């Protein structure tokens, strides 16, 4: 039930997603090891993901959280990078997209920094880099990230290195 609609680079919606992508790049403490060495991206395509069933699943749960948190879903737009992006867009997030060894337990992780999610595109720690060249810092191969609508509700605050 998923269809992908291409956005024109002229569309203000394309532009505001691109801007969030570019403006949230930072330097990482691994010096580029996991995600590569870069200060910005070349954006090749942005597509809107439409799946009625997955959308209503999302909104049904959003309402539940909202009613548990003084009518405040605490919804954000956040980045997610994963080897499983194609399963995610067709079947939704589930158990199988969790980070079992993440510092905040086994759950599904999202970032405000696009460059942080970029570190997971080829796997945890960048895996072995791109399929074609085995290069975590590959400048040739096409990468994909998700920009996602996320319900946080009442969020537990963990201070941390």
């Amino acid at each position: 039930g998923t269809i992908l609609i291409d956005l024109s680079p002229d569309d203000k919606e394309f532009q505001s997603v691109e801007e969030e992508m570019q403006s949230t790049v930072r330097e990482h403490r691994d010096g580029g090891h996991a995600g590569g060495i870069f200060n910005r991206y070349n954006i090749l395509k942005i597509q809107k993901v439409c799946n009625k069933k997955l959308w209503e699943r999302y909104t049904h749960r959003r309402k539940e959280v909202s009613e548990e948190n003084h009518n405040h879903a605490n919804e954000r737009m956040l980045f997610h990078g994963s080897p499983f992006v194609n399963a995610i867009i067709h079947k939704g997030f589930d158990e199988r997209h969790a980070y079992i060894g993440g510092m905040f337990g086994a759950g599904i992780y999202f970032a405000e920094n696009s460059s942080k999610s970029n570190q997971y595109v080829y796997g945890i720690g960048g895996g072995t880099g791109c399929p074609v060249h085995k290069d975590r810092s590959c400048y040739i191969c096409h990468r994909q990230l998700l920009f996602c609508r996320v319900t946080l509700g009442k969020s537990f605050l963990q201070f941390s290195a």
Partner: protein, 47 residues
């Protein structure tokens, strides 16, 4: 998949050393996210 801490719907990882890092978040139910945009890109070699 683990559970949220009792009485919470998610975890926020707040950076407490790297002054430039933004926050990271964790949810424990798939239904709390919708994958709205697919962005295809390349990283660019600095000059």
């Amino acid at each position: 998949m683990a559970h949220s801490p009792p009485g919470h719907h998610s975890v926020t990882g707040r950076p407490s050393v790297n002054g430039l890092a933004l926050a990271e978040y964790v949810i424990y139910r798939g239904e709390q996210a919708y994958p709205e945009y697919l962005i295809t890109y390349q990283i660019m070699r600095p000059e």
